[PDB]
Structure formats: C-alpha cells, structure tokens
Coordinates of C-alpha atoms and ligand atoms in Angstrom, one line a residue:
Chain G
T299 CA -63.6 58.0 -5.5
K300 CA -65.4 59.8 -8.5
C301 CA -63.5 57.7 -11.1
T302 CA -63.7 54.9 -8.8
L303 CA -67.2 54.6 -8.9
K304 CA -67.8 56.4 -12.0
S305 CA -70.1 58.5 -10.0
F306 CA -70.7 62.5 -9.5
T307 CA -72.3 61.5 -6.6
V308 CA -70.3 59.7 -3.9
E309 CA -72.4 58.6 -0.2
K310 CA -71.0 58.3 3.0
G311 CA -68.1 55.8 4.0
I312 CA -65.1 55.1 2.9
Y313 CA -63.9 53.6 -0.7
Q314 CA -60.4 52.1 -1.8
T315 CA -59.8 54.0 -5.4
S316 CA -57.6 52.9 -8.0
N317 CA -54.0 54.5 -8.3
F318 CA -54.5 57.4 -10.9
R319 CA -51.9 60.4 -9.4
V320 CA -48.7 59.7 -10.4
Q321 CA -47.9 59.4 -13.8
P322 CA -44.1 58.5 -14.6
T323 CA -42.5 61.8 -16.8
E324 CA -38.7 60.2 -17.3
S325 CA -37.5 57.4 -19.2
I326 CA -34.1 56.0 -18.2
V327 CA -32.6 53.0 -20.2
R328 CA -29.6 50.6 -19.1
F329 CA -27.7 48.1 -21.2
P330 CA -23.9 46.2 -21.0
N331 CA -21.0 48.4 -22.1
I332 CA -21.1 46.8 -25.6
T333 CA -20.0 49.1 -28.3
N334 CA -17.8 46.2 -30.9
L335 CA -20.7 46.1 -34.1
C336 CA -21.8 42.3 -34.6
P337 CA -19.9 40.5 -36.7
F338 CA -23.3 40.3 -39.3
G339 CA -20.5 40.8 -42.3
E340 CA -19.4 37.3 -41.7
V341 CA -22.7 35.9 -41.7
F342 CA -24.0 37.9 -43.9
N343 CA -21.4 38.3 -46.9
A344 CA -19.8 35.3 -46.7
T345 CA -18.6 34.2 -50.5
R346 CA -19.8 30.6 -49.4
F347 CA -22.5 29.0 -47.3
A348 CA -22.9 25.4 -45.9
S349 CA -25.7 23.6 -48.0
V350 CA -28.8 23.0 -45.6
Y351 CA -28.0 19.1 -44.7
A352 CA -25.1 20.7 -42.6
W353 CA -26.3 24.0 -41.6
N354 CA -23.5 25.5 -40.0
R355 CA -24.2 27.3 -36.7
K356 CA -22.2 30.9 -35.8
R357 CA -22.7 32.3 -31.4
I358 CA -22.9 35.3 -32.1
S359 CA -21.5 37.7 -28.8
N360 CA -20.2 40.6 -27.4
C361 CA -21.5 42.9 -29.2
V362 CA -24.1 45.0 -30.5
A363 CA -26.7 43.7 -32.6
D364 CA -27.8 46.6 -35.2
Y365 CA -29.4 45.4 -37.7
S366 CA -30.0 48.9 -39.6
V367 CA -26.5 49.0 -41.4
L368 CA -27.7 45.8 -43.6
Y369 CA -30.6 48.6 -44.8
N370 CA -27.7 49.9 -47.1
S371 CA -25.9 46.9 -48.8
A372 CA -28.9 44.3 -49.2
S373 CA -32.8 43.5 -49.2
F374 CA -34.0 41.2 -47.3
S375 CA -37.7 39.3 -49.4
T376 CA -38.7 37.6 -45.7
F377 CA -38.7 38.7 -42.1
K378 CA -40.5 37.1 -39.9
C379 CA -40.2 37.0 -36.4
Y380 CA -41.6 34.4 -33.9
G381 CA -42.0 35.6 -30.3
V382 CA -40.5 38.6 -31.0
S383 CA -42.0 41.6 -33.2
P384 CA -39.7 43.0 -35.3
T385 CA -40.5 46.4 -33.9
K386 CA -38.9 46.6 -30.5
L387 CA -35.7 44.5 -32.0
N388 CA -33.7 47.0 -31.7
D389 CA -35.0 47.6 -27.5
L390 CA -34.9 44.0 -26.1
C391 CA -31.8 42.5 -25.2
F392 CA -31.1 39.4 -26.4
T393 CA -29.1 36.2 -23.8
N394 CA -28.2 33.9 -26.7
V395 CA -27.8 34.8 -30.5
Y396 CA -27.3 31.3 -32.6
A397 CA -26.9 32.2 -36.5
Chain Z
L546 CA -37.2 44.3 -19.6
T547 CA -39.1 47.7 -19.6
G548 CA -41.4 48.6 -17.0
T549 CA -42.6 51.7 -14.7
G550 CA -42.2 51.4 -10.9
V551 CA -39.8 52.4 -8.4
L552 CA -36.2 51.3 -8.2
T553 CA -34.9 50.6 -4.7
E554 CA -31.3 49.0 -3.2
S555 CA -31.4 45.5 -2.9
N556 CA -29.4 42.8 -0.7
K557 CA -30.2 39.8 -2.0
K558 CA -27.4 37.7 -3.7
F559 CA -27.1 36.5 -6.9
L560 CA -26.0 33.4 -8.5
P561 CA -23.7 34.4 -12.2
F562 CA -25.7 32.4 -14.3
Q563 CA -28.9 34.5 -13.6
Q564 CA -29.8 37.6 -13.9
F565 CA -33.9 38.6 -12.7
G566 CA -35.5 37.9 -9.7
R567 CA -38.9 37.1 -9.6
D568 CA -40.1 36.6 -5.9
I569 CA -44.0 35.9 -6.8
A570 CA -43.4 34.8 -10.3
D571 CA -45.9 37.0 -12.1
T572 CA -44.2 40.4 -11.5
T573 CA -40.3 40.7 -12.0
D574 CA -39.0 42.0 -8.4
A575 CA -34.9 42.1 -8.8
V576 CA -32.8 42.9 -11.6
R577 CA -28.9 42.7 -11.7
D578 CA -28.2 46.4 -13.1
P579 CA -25.7 46.3 -16.6
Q580 CA -23.2 48.3 -16.3
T581 CA -22.9 48.1 -12.2
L582 CA -23.1 44.6 -11.4
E583 CA -25.2 45.8 -7.3
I584 CA -28.8 44.4 -7.1
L585 CA -32.1 46.5 -7.9
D586 CA -35.3 45.3 -6.8
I587 CA -38.2 46.8 -8.3
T588 CA -41.2 48.2 -5.7
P589 CA -44.3 48.8 -7.5
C590 CA -44.6 52.7 -8.7
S591 CA -47.9 53.0 -6.3
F592 CA -48.2 51.5 -2.7
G593 CA -50.9 50.2 -1.0
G594 CA -54.0 51.5 -1.8
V595 CA -55.4 54.5 -0.2
Chain X
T645 CA -52.7 54.9 13.5
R646 CA -52.3 50.3 13.3
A647 CA -53.7 51.0 10.1
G648 CA -51.9 53.5 8.9
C649 CA -51.6 57.1 8.5
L650 CA -54.4 59.9 8.6
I651 CA -54.2 63.1 6.6
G652 CA -57.3 65.4 6.2
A653 CA -59.0 64.8 9.6
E654 CA -57.8 66.4 13.2
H655 CA -57.7 64.0 16.0
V656 CA -59.9 64.6 19.8
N657 CA -59.5 63.4 22.6
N658 CA -63.0 63.0 23.2
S659 CA -65.1 59.6 22.6
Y660 CA -67.9 59.1 20.3
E661 CA -69.8 56.6 18.9
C662 CA -68.5 55.1 14.8
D663 CA -69.7 57.0 11.9
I664 CA -67.1 56.1 9.0
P665 CA -65.1 53.2 10.4
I666 CA -61.8 54.0 9.4
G667 CA -60.0 51.5 11.4
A668 CA -57.7 49.5 14.3
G669 CA -60.1 51.5 17.2
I670 CA -60.3 54.5 15.0
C671 CA -63.5 56.5 13.3
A672 CA -64.3 59.2 11.5
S673 CA -67.4 61.7 11.8
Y674 CA -68.4 65.3 10.5
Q675 CA -68.4 67.7 13.1
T676 CA -68.3 71.5 14.3
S689 CA -67.0 75.1 10.9
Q690 CA -68.1 72.3 10.3
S691 CA -65.2 69.4 9.4
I692 CA -63.5 65.8 9.2
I693 CA -62.9 65.1 13.0
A694 CA -61.1 61.4 13.4
Chain W
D398 CA -51.7 57.2 -50.3
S399 CA -50.1 56.1 -53.2
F400 CA -46.4 55.3 -53.6
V401 CA -43.7 53.1 -55.7
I402 CA -41.8 50.3 -54.1
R403 CA -39.5 47.8 -54.9
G404 CA -40.4 43.9 -54.4
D405 CA -38.7 43.0 -50.9
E406 CA -40.1 46.3 -49.3
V407 CA -43.8 44.8 -50.2
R408 CA -43.5 43.2 -46.4
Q409 CA -42.2 46.4 -45.0
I410 CA -45.5 48.0 -46.3
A411 CA -47.8 45.7 -43.0
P412 CA -47.8 47.7 -39.6
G413 CA -44.9 46.2 -37.4
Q414 CA -43.0 45.9 -39.8
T415 CA -39.2 47.0 -39.4
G416 CA -36.8 48.0 -42.8
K417 CA -36.3 51.2 -45.0
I418 CA -39.5 52.0 -45.8
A419 CA -41.3 51.4 -42.6
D420 CA -38.8 53.3 -40.1
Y421 CA -37.7 56.4 -42.3
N422 CA -40.3 56.4 -45.5
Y423 CA -43.3 55.3 -44.9
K424 CA -44.9 54.5 -41.0
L425 CA -48.4 52.9 -41.0
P426 CA -49.7 53.3 -37.5
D427 CA -50.1 49.7 -35.0
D428 CA -54.4 50.1 -35.8
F429 CA -54.4 50.5 -39.4
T430 CA -58.0 50.0 -40.1
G431 CA -57.9 50.2 -44.0
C432 CA -55.6 48.1 -46.9
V433 CA -53.1 47.9 -48.5
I434 CA -53.0 47.0 -52.6
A435 CA -50.4 46.2 -53.7
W436 CA -49.1 45.3 -58.4
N437 CA -46.1 45.3 -60.5
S438 CA -45.3 47.6 -62.9
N439 CA -42.2 46.8 -64.5
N440 CA -43.8 48.2 -67.8
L441 CA -44.5 51.2 -66.4
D442 CA -42.2 52.9 -64.3
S443 CA -39.2 50.9 -65.7
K444 CA -37.6 51.9 -68.9
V445 CA -34.5 50.8 -70.2
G446 CA -31.0 52.1 -68.8
Chain Y
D745 CA -45.4 48.1 -13.2
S746 CA -46.5 47.5 -17.3
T747 CA -45.6 50.0 -19.3
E748 CA -49.2 50.9 -20.3
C749 CA -50.8 50.6 -16.9
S750 CA -53.5 53.5 -17.7
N751 CA -54.8 51.9 -20.2
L752 CA -54.8 48.6 -19.1
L753 CA -57.1 50.0 -16.1
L754 CA -59.4 51.9 -18.6
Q755 CA -59.8 48.8 -19.7
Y756 CA -60.2 46.6 -17.1
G757 CA -60.9 48.0 -13.6
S758 CA -64.2 47.8 -13.3
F759 CA -64.3 44.4 -12.8
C760 CA -61.6 44.1 -10.3
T761 CA -62.8 47.1 -8.6
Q762 CA -66.6 44.9 -8.3
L763 CA -64.7 42.0 -7.3
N764 CA -62.7 44.6 -4.3
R765 CA -66.0 45.8 -3.3
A766 CA -67.3 41.7 -3.1
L767 CA -64.4 41.4 -0.7
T768 CA -64.7 44.9 1.1
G769 CA -67.9 43.8 2.3
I770 CA -66.8 40.6 3.3
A771 CA -64.4 42.7 5.6
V772 CA -67.1 44.9 6.5
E773 CA -69.6 41.9 7.4
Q774 CA -66.9 40.0 9.8
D775 CA -66.9 44.0 11.4
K776 CA -70.1 43.7 11.7
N777 CA -70.0 40.0 13.4
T778 CA -67.2 41.3 16.0
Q779 CA -69.5 43.9 17.0
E780 CA -72.9 41.8 16.8
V781 CA -70.7 39.0 19.6
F782 CA -69.0 40.6 21.6
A783 CA -70.3 44.6 21.6
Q784 CA -74.2 43.3 22.7
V785 CA -74.2 46.1 26.1
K786 CA -72.5 49.6 25.2
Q787 CA -72.1 49.9 29.2
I788 CA -68.6 49.1 30.5
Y789 CA -68.2 48.9 34.0
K790 CA -65.1 49.2 36.7
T791 CA -63.5 45.5 37.5
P792 CA -64.5 45.3 41.4
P793 CA -61.3 45.3 43.7
Chain N
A852 CA -47.9 43.6 -0.2
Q853 CA -45.7 42.9 -3.8
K854 CA -45.5 40.0 -2.3
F855 CA -49.1 39.1 -2.1
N856 CA -49.5 40.8 -5.3
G857 CA -52.0 43.1 -3.3
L858 CA -53.3 41.2 -1.2
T859 CA -53.3 43.0 2.3
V860 CA -54.4 42.4 5.4
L861 CA -57.0 44.9 6.8
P862 CA -57.0 45.5 10.6
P863 CA -60.3 44.9 12.8
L864 CA -62.4 47.7 13.6
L865 CA -62.4 46.3 16.8
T866 CA -58.8 45.6 18.6
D867 CA -57.9 43.2 21.2
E868 CA -58.0 45.6 23.6
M869 CA -61.5 47.1 23.2
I870 CA -62.4 43.7 22.7
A871 CA -60.7 42.5 25.6
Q872 CA -62.6 45.7 27.6
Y873 CA -65.8 44.4 26.2
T874 CA -65.5 40.5 27.7
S875 CA -64.1 42.3 30.8
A876 CA -66.8 44.6 30.9
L877 CA -69.3 41.9 30.9
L878 CA -67.6 39.3 33.5
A879 CA -68.3 42.4 35.6
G880 CA -71.7 42.9 34.9
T881 CA -72.3 39.2 34.9
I882 CA -71.1 38.8 38.5
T883 CA -71.8 42.0 39.7
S884 CA -75.4 42.9 38.7
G885 CA -77.2 39.1 37.3
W886 CA -79.6 40.3 34.7
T887 CA -80.1 43.9 35.3
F888 CA -76.8 44.3 33.4
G889 CA -78.4 45.5 30.0
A890 CA -81.8 46.5 30.7
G891 CA -80.6 50.3 31.6
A892 CA -79.2 50.6 35.1
Chain M
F497 CA -34.9 50.4 -61.6
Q498 CA -34.4 48.1 -64.9
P499 CA -36.2 45.8 -67.0
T500 CA -33.6 43.0 -66.6
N501 CA -33.8 43.0 -62.7
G502 CA -35.4 40.5 -60.6
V503 CA -38.4 40.0 -59.2
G504 CA -37.3 41.6 -55.8
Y505 CA -35.8 44.7 -57.7
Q506 CA -39.0 45.1 -60.4
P507 CA -40.8 48.3 -59.3
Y508 CA -44.3 48.0 -57.2
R509 CA -47.0 49.7 -57.2
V510 CA -48.6 50.0 -53.3
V511 CA -52.0 52.4 -52.8
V512 CA -52.8 52.3 -49.3
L513 CA -56.5 53.4 -48.1
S514 CA -57.5 54.4 -44.7
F515 CA -60.2 55.2 -43.0
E516 CA -62.6 55.1 -39.9
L517 CA -65.5 52.8 -39.6
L518 CA -68.9 53.3 -38.3
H519 CA -67.7 56.4 -36.2
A520 CA -69.1 59.5 -38.3
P521 CA -71.5 60.6 -41.0
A522 CA -70.3 57.9 -44.2
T523 CA -69.7 59.9 -47.6
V524 CA -68.6 57.2 -49.5
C525 CA -70.5 53.4 -49.7
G526 CA -70.1 50.1 -51.4
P527 CA -72.6 48.9 -54.5
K528 CA -75.7 47.4 -52.8
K529 CA -78.7 49.1 -54.3
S530 CA -80.6 51.1 -51.4
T531 CA -84.3 49.8 -50.6
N532 CA -87.6 50.8 -49.5
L533 CA -87.7 51.4 -45.1
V534 CA -90.2 50.0 -42.8
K535 CA -91.1 50.9 -40.2
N536 CA -91.9 49.5 -36.7
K537 CA -91.2 45.7 -37.9
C538 CA -88.7 43.2 -36.8
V539 CA -85.9 43.2 -39.9
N540 CA -82.3 42.7 -40.7
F541 CA -81.1 46.3 -41.4
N542 CA -77.9 47.7 -42.5
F543 CA -77.9 52.0 -42.1
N544 CA -74.9 53.5 -43.3
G545 CA -72.9 49.7 -43.6
Chain I
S943 CA -55.4 21.7 22.8
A944 CA -59.4 21.9 22.0
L945 CA -59.0 25.3 20.9
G946 CA -57.1 24.2 17.4
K947 CA -60.5 25.2 15.8
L948 CA -59.6 28.8 15.6
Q949 CA -56.4 27.6 14.5
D950 CA -58.1 25.7 11.4
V951 CA -59.6 28.8 10.4
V952 CA -56.2 30.9 10.6
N953 CA -54.7 28.0 8.8
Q954 CA -57.3 27.8 6.5
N955 CA -57.2 31.2 5.6
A956 CA -53.4 30.9 5.0
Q957 CA -54.0 28.4 2.5
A958 CA -56.7 30.1 0.8
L959 CA -53.6 32.7 -0.4
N960 CA -51.2 30.0 -0.7
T961 CA -53.8 28.6 -3.5
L962 CA -54.2 32.0 -4.8
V963 CA -50.6 33.4 -5.3
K964 CA -50.4 29.8 -7.3
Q965 CA -53.0 30.5 -9.1
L966 CA -50.6 33.5 -9.9
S967 CA -48.1 31.3 -10.8
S968 CA -49.9 29.8 -14.4
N969 CA -49.1 31.9 -17.4
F970 CA -53.0 31.2 -18.1
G971 CA -51.6 29.1 -22.1
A972 CA -49.6 32.6 -22.7
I973 CA -45.9 33.7 -24.4
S974 CA -44.8 34.3 -20.7
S975 CA -46.2 34.7 -17.0
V976 CA -44.4 37.7 -16.1
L977 CA -46.6 41.4 -17.3
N978 CA -43.7 43.2 -18.5
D979 CA -42.3 40.5 -20.7
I980 CA -45.1 40.2 -22.8
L981 CA -44.9 44.5 -23.0
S982 CA -41.4 44.0 -24.0
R983 CA -40.6 41.7 -26.5
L984 CA -44.2 42.0 -28.6
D985 CA -45.8 44.7 -30.1
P986 CA -49.3 46.2 -28.9
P987 CA -51.2 44.7 -31.9
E988 CA -50.1 41.1 -30.8
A989 CA -50.4 41.8 -27.3
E990 CA -53.6 42.7 -26.7
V991 CA -55.1 39.5 -27.4
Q992 CA -52.1 37.6 -25.0
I993 CA -53.0 40.4 -22.1
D994 CA -56.3 39.7 -22.2
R995 CA -55.3 36.2 -22.0
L996 CA -53.1 36.5 -19.0
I997 CA -54.8 39.4 -16.9
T998 CA -58.1 37.0 -17.4
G999 CA -56.5 34.4 -15.7
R1000 CA -55.4 36.3 -13.1
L1001 CA -59.5 37.9 -12.6
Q1002 CA -60.4 34.6 -12.8
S1003 CA -57.8 34.1 -10.0
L1004 CA -59.4 36.4 -7.8
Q1005 CA -63.1 35.7 -8.8
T1006 CA -62.1 32.4 -7.4
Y1007 CA -60.9 34.0 -4.2
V1008 CA -64.2 36.0 -4.0
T1009 CA -66.3 32.9 -4.8
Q1010 CA -64.3 30.7 -1.5
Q1011 CA -64.2 33.8 0.9
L1012 CA -67.7 34.2 0.6
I1013 CA -68.2 30.5 1.4
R1014 CA -66.0 30.8 4.3
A1015 CA -67.4 33.8 4.8
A1016 CA -71.0 32.5 5.5
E1017 CA -69.9 29.5 8.0
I1018 CA -68.1 32.1 9.9
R1019 CA -71.1 34.2 9.6
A1020 CA -73.5 31.2 10.4
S1021 CA -70.8 30.4 13.5
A1022 CA -70.8 34.1 14.6
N1023 CA -74.2 34.2 14.5
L1024 CA -74.2 31.1 17.2
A1025 CA -72.3 32.2 19.2
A1026 CA -74.3 36.2 19.7
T1027 CA -77.4 33.6 20.6
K1028 CA -74.8 32.5 22.7
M1029 CA -74.2 35.4 24.6
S1030 CA -77.5 36.9 24.4
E1031 CA -79.3 33.6 25.7
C1032 CA -76.5 32.1 28.3
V1033 CA -74.3 35.1 29.2
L1034 CA -77.1 37.8 29.5
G1035 CA -79.7 35.9 31.0
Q1036 CA -80.9 31.7 31.8
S1037 CA -81.6 29.6 29.4
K1038 CA -83.8 26.7 29.7
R1039 CA -82.8 25.2 26.9
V1040 CA -81.2 21.9 26.6
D1041 CA -77.4 20.9 25.7
Chain S
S943 CA -80.0 60.7 9.1
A944 CA -82.5 58.6 10.0
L945 CA -84.1 55.7 8.4
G946 CA -80.5 55.1 7.0
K947 CA -80.3 51.1 6.1
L948 CA -82.5 50.9 3.3
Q949 CA -81.6 54.4 2.1
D950 CA -77.9 51.6 2.0
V951 CA -79.7 49.1 0.5
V952 CA -81.1 50.9 -1.7
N953 CA -78.1 53.0 -3.1
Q954 CA -75.8 49.7 -2.7
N955 CA -78.9 48.4 -5.7
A956 CA -78.2 51.5 -7.7
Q957 CA -74.2 50.9 -7.5
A958 CA -75.2 47.0 -8.6
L959 CA -76.5 47.9 -11.5
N960 CA -74.0 51.2 -12.2
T961 CA -71.4 49.6 -11.6
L962 CA -72.6 46.0 -13.7
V963 CA -73.2 49.2 -17.2
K964 CA -69.9 50.7 -16.5
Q965 CA -67.9 47.3 -16.8
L966 CA -70.7 45.9 -19.5
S967 CA -69.4 49.6 -21.1
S968 CA -66.1 48.0 -21.8
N969 CA -64.3 46.5 -24.9
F970 CA -63.0 43.2 -23.4
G971 CA -59.7 43.6 -25.7
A972 CA -62.0 43.4 -28.5
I973 CA -62.1 45.2 -31.3
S974 CA -64.9 47.6 -31.0
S975 CA -67.1 47.6 -27.9
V976 CA -70.4 47.5 -29.9
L977 CA -71.3 43.8 -31.1
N978 CA -73.3 44.8 -34.6
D979 CA -69.8 47.2 -35.6
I980 CA -67.7 43.9 -35.6
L981 CA -70.5 41.9 -37.0
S982 CA -71.0 44.4 -39.8
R983 CA -67.3 45.1 -40.5
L984 CA -65.8 41.5 -40.1
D985 CA -66.1 38.5 -41.5
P986 CA -67.5 35.7 -39.1
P987 CA -64.4 32.4 -38.8
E988 CA -61.9 35.7 -37.2
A989 CA -64.8 37.5 -35.6
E990 CA -65.7 34.2 -33.3
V991 CA -62.8 35.5 -31.5
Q992 CA -63.3 39.0 -30.7
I993 CA -67.3 37.6 -30.4
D994 CA -67.2 35.2 -27.8
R995 CA -64.3 37.4 -26.8
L996 CA -66.3 40.5 -25.7
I997 CA -69.5 38.2 -24.8
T998 CA -68.0 35.7 -22.1
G999 CA -66.8 39.3 -20.6
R1000 CA -69.6 40.4 -20.6
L1001 CA -71.3 37.7 -19.3
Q1002 CA -68.7 37.2 -16.1
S1003 CA -68.9 40.5 -16.0
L1004 CA -73.1 39.5 -15.0
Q1005 CA -71.3 37.0 -12.6
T1006 CA -69.1 39.3 -10.7
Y1007 CA -72.9 41.2 -10.6
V1008 CA -74.5 37.8 -9.5
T1009 CA -71.9 37.4 -6.8
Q1010 CA -72.1 41.2 -5.5
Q1011 CA -76.0 40.2 -5.0
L1012 CA -75.2 36.4 -3.3
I1013 CA -72.8 38.2 -0.5
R1014 CA -75.8 41.4 -0.1
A1015 CA -78.9 38.9 0.2
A1016 CA -76.6 37.1 2.5
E1017 CA -76.8 40.4 4.8
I1018 CA -80.2 41.0 4.3
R1019 CA -81.1 37.4 4.8
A1020 CA -79.4 37.6 8.0
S1021 CA -81.4 41.1 8.9
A1022 CA -84.4 39.3 7.5
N1023 CA -83.9 36.6 9.9
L1024 CA -83.4 38.5 13.3
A1025 CA -86.0 40.5 12.1
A1026 CA -88.2 37.5 11.9
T1027 CA -87.3 35.8 15.0
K1028 CA -87.7 38.9 16.4
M1029 CA -91.5 39.1 14.9
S1030 CA -91.6 35.2 16.5
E1031 CA -90.3 36.4 20.2
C1032 CA -91.0 40.5 20.8
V1033 CA -94.3 40.6 19.5
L1034 CA -96.7 37.6 19.3
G1035 CA -94.5 37.4 23.0
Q1036 CA -92.5 38.6 26.0
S1037 CA -88.5 38.2 25.7
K1038 CA -86.8 37.3 28.0
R1039 CA -83.7 37.9 26.4
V1040 CA -82.1 41.0 27.6
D1041 CA -80.8 43.8 25.1
Ligands
LIG1 C1 -20.5 42.7 -49.2 O1 -18.9 42.6 -49.6 C2 -18.7 43.2 -50.9 C3 -17.2 43.1 -51.0 O2 -16.4 43.3 -50.6 C4 -19.2 44.4 -50.3 O3 -19.2 45.8 -51.9 C5 -20.2 45.1 -49.6 O4 -20.9 46.0 -49.8 C6 -20.7 44.5 -48.3 N1 -21.7 43.9 -48.0 C7 -21.2 44.3 -46.4 C8 -22.7 43.9 -45.8 O5 -21.0 45.5 -46.1
LIG2 C1 -19.0 51.2 -18.3 O1 -17.8 52.6 -19.2 C2 -18.8 53.7 -18.1 C3 -17.4 55.0 -18.8 O2 -16.5 54.8 -18.8 C4 -18.0 53.1 -16.9 O3 -18.3 54.6 -15.7 C5 -18.6 52.6 -16.5 O4 -18.4 52.0 -15.1 C6 -18.7 51.3 -17.1 N1 -19.5 50.0 -16.6 C7 -18.4 48.7 -16.8 C8 -17.0 48.3 -15.9 O5 -19.8 47.7 -17.1
LIG3 C1 -55.1 64.5 24.8 O1 -53.9 63.9 25.5 C2 -52.5 63.4 25.3 C3 -51.7 62.7 25.9 O2 -50.2 62.9 25.8 C4 -52.0 64.9 24.7 O3 -50.9 65.2 24.7 C5 -53.3 65.5 24.0 O4 -52.4 67.4 24.3 C6 -54.0 66.2 24.6 N1 -55.0 66.8 23.2 C7 -56.1 67.6 23.5 C8 -55.5 68.8 24.2 O5 -57.5 67.3 23.6

C-alpha cells in the first residue's frame, strides 16, 4: 500500500495494490528436436552465385541456425536486420526462411 | 516466444497449421509445446489484484 | 465471502455498522487486544 | 577504450550488434552514452610480411 | 506477462493507478447510490403474518 | 479476468438478499406504521 | 594484417569514449569560455553543461 | 417488457467492455500487437519506443473507458438521486407534487 | 473520529496532488526525466521526439488529474446540492419529508 499510494502514511480503508510480491528466479527454454546444422556452407560458400536479374531463392528448414560457425571462415561487411535485432537472434525461432 | 507467467494444461484443440493462440489480441494465451505436442496455455503470473 | 477469501481478520457472529466496506455484505473494523474484525 | 580491429568489424562496435568482436571481445552496453571514433591505420600498424 | 515487468511498473504504474483510483471512485459512487436509494431508514420490521 | 485483460467486476456491498430485506422492511413499515416509521419508534 | 590486403582487411583503430552526463561534478569540459555570473535576472544559463 | 430500460444499462455496460477489448485489438501503429513479441523480437534500445507506443495506446484506451464510465455514472447518479427523492417524498410520506 | 468527511476531502485533494507529482516524476520513456538535460545534450531535430514524448506524457498525466478532479467534483456537487436543498428546506422551513 505504501508503494502503490507512494506515501509512507496510509489512511483508513481498502486499497488495491500493484503486484510486487512475486519475482521469478528460474528460466526454462523449450525449442523443437532439431540438431542438424543448417546448410550455411551451400548458401554462403558456393563457387557460383546467380546474377541479380535472376536472384536465387533457397528454402532453409528442419535444422538449427547457428550463426557463430560463420565467424571463422568469412567476415561480413554489412549485417543489417529489420524487424529483428542482431541481438536475441540466437534466442528466437524462425518459421519460414528463404535465403 | 519469451514471457513470465504460469503455465497450465490446455483443453483447446489446435489446427496443424497454427502454433500460438491469443484469446485477446493483445496477449498470447495458449501455445503448442515443441518437444511434446500437448497444448499449454499461459495464465498470468499474478492473479486478480489483492 | 462471495467477493473472495479474507485472511488477516477474524469473523464474528455479531453485526455492527460498516466502517471499511469489504464488499458482498462484509465489512471490517478495528475493535477489541485491538484487532481487525470482519 | 582503445583497440585495433579490421574494417568489416567496425560496425560490430556499435551497440546492439553481434560478431566475433561484439560477443567474445568487446561489447558496448545497450544504453551507451558516448562516442565511437574509428580511423584507418594501414600506414602505421600494417607492415610488409 | 512481459519479461521486464518491474521496469514497466516503475515507468508506467502511477498513471494506471490514478485511472484505477477513478474507477474505484466510480464503484464507491454506485455503492453509495444504492445506500442512498434503498437504505433510507435503518429500522427492520418483521413481515406481518 | 485474464480474458478481459484485467477488467474485473466488483460485487456490490449491498447484496440482493439484503436489498430485498430492506424493501420488505419498507413495505412492512409503510403498511403498518404510516409515516411514523422513520421518526424513531 | 598485410599492406596489400583489401579495405575490409586493413587495420582500423577504434577509440570509444564512455562518459556520464549531468549526474555528477565534472572534471572535463568543452571549448566554451566562461563569463561573469548575473544574480536575480531572467537569463540564459549554462551551468556545468 | 417495460423493464428493459434497466436491461439497456446492463447492455450498455457490456457494450462498453466490448468496445474496450476491441481497443486492445489494435497495435496502435507498432510492429506487433502482442507485448511479448515486441520484447522477444527486438533488443531493448529499439524497444522502449515501441513499448511506449503500444502501452500508451492501451492506457489511452483505459482513460477513454474511464471517461465513458464517468458519463454513464453521472447519468446513473442523476437517476439514483431522482429515485431517492421518490423514496423520501412518496414512499415515506404523501407528496402533493403533480405527476 | 468525527468530522471524517471533511478530512477525507482534504486528504483526497492532497492524495490527488501527490499522485500528480509521482506521475510527473516519471521519465515517460524519454532519455532523461529532466527536460533541461535533453535540451542540453541533444540537438533539436532528433530531440523533438523526446520533447513531445515527455511533454505529452506530462499533459496526459494532467488529463487524468483533471478527470479525477471531475469525479470528485461530481461527488462534491451531489453533497453540495443536498446541503443547498437542506438549507432551503430544513433551515428556512419545516420539512414533512421523513429522515
Ligand atoms: C569454404 O570452402 C573452402 C574450400 O573447401 C574451405 O577452405 C572453407 O573453409 C569453407 N568455408 C566454410 C564456410 O567452411
Ligand atoms: C526429443 O528427444 C527427447 C530425447 O530422446 C525425447 O525425450 C523427446 O520426446 C523428443 N521430442 C520429440 C519427439 O520431438
Ligand atoms: C456463529 O454461528 C455459526 C453457525 O453455523 C457457528 O458455527 C459458529 O460457531 C458461531 N460462532 C461463534 C461462536 O460466534
């Protein structure tokens, strides 16, 4: 009541209060049974790429997207993501992926 | 989907093409657990205000 | 109560005038040591 | 805070970015209230061989 | 059920608290309306047989 | 509750049973006492 | 690093200045030269930034 | 039924809540309507403005509901004052007032 | 414990002003709660967003202060109309109305 009314003194009556009593202390993460590595080598390390007039669309599915494996071999000059931050990308699932 | 709330058993049927279930548009209410396909609906961490 | 459970006050069968309105026909007051009664 | 990186990793300095520098080497806090000053130094740091 | 719940309460709880105080005043106003209309004389008499 | 995004309804302090009791008392007093009901005894 | 490498592989020196603003007494300031103080007058003031 | 006037009040109450929850349906020009989606998809520094926009729309909805409740409470208070006048002047005593 | 109504009015006014101060103390999603700070350390074209965020947040807080004053003034008007009707009937005349 002192926190909700923002005052040390509280007058006689009944007061509705905001929830400060419960603070969580555990974290659970549930993600599907996927362990195969995504074919990042095929879409990043191919000898031949199609031109811009016919851009090549590749479906990515049924795998786990670990972006770290890409740090060692290559470095990306531009990495700009819209709608999703570069952070929390590894903590977040993706429904439909086309490269 | 990230959140802080109580999880309880759901008796709501889900069609195969849909994953989440929002009773009110603003808040997600139910989810399909990925490892076990049983439906799990999310009740708030706090109940009705004391 | 019909409004909900009350913990922290003692229920008495005697009826007095309402001081703090709990609701659903229940009220609370500070009376005699001294304690909150519903 | 002074260090030396590559050209591609300069964008990794900015807060909210991910990379080999951001995750494992140097991470700006989300609410950074400061400046980042980067300049090319091919004549000084780089040497033949 | 947001992750950063306490920060949201700290930044935006007093505004909602004022609105909830207004709604509680509405509820007390309607209760007092019932008390004024129905409870005018507090004497209770048995129904005649 | 959760479905109304936190909008709950508060039950009134005067329940329908006590309201019916108040109306029964008013009817009994109006029939049996005239206008001497509210003036004390 | 090699001097014949591309612009992405050339060295870049990065200095990150981190500072807190208007929450503490200041030990470092800018190029603005201080003027005389005026008391009890409606005037534009710049006190410690 | 000539009693449906009170029904109107009940219906009006329900109608207000219906409109209120419809106001929770809109995202108020944000990325997503759901709070948790905005928390999960974006890093916090991009997310303060989106959270501010979304819950500011929600709080404006609550304020508008408060104003509508106050209008209907003024009408109900006027009707209750009239009914209490009928209680004091006609039930308890005889009224010479016409009509 | 007599005279509780007048003391309740005074405490309600004090609580309304205190809640106004506590709402106004919030930063309303801006960089800093102080307007002078975000004039001093931010150039105007991107500063205007923080300006009107903080300012409209403060103004909205006044709106809810105004509406709380409105419902309190409605209750006070009900009590004052009761008092005026009593001064017209109880004091300057004899009322047959019971209780
Ligand atoms: C790409 O292929 C080359 C040649 O096999 C290899 O040396 C390099 O390590 C590969 N990079 C990745 C993505 O593993
Ligand atoms: C995932 O694997 C674990 C361990 O074998 C198993 O217990 C669980 O049921 C699996 N879930 C599925 C089938 O998606
Ligand atoms: C009040 O009356 C109830 C009737 O069920 C009884 O059970 C209870 O013990 C009484 N309480 C007392 C002793 O005041």
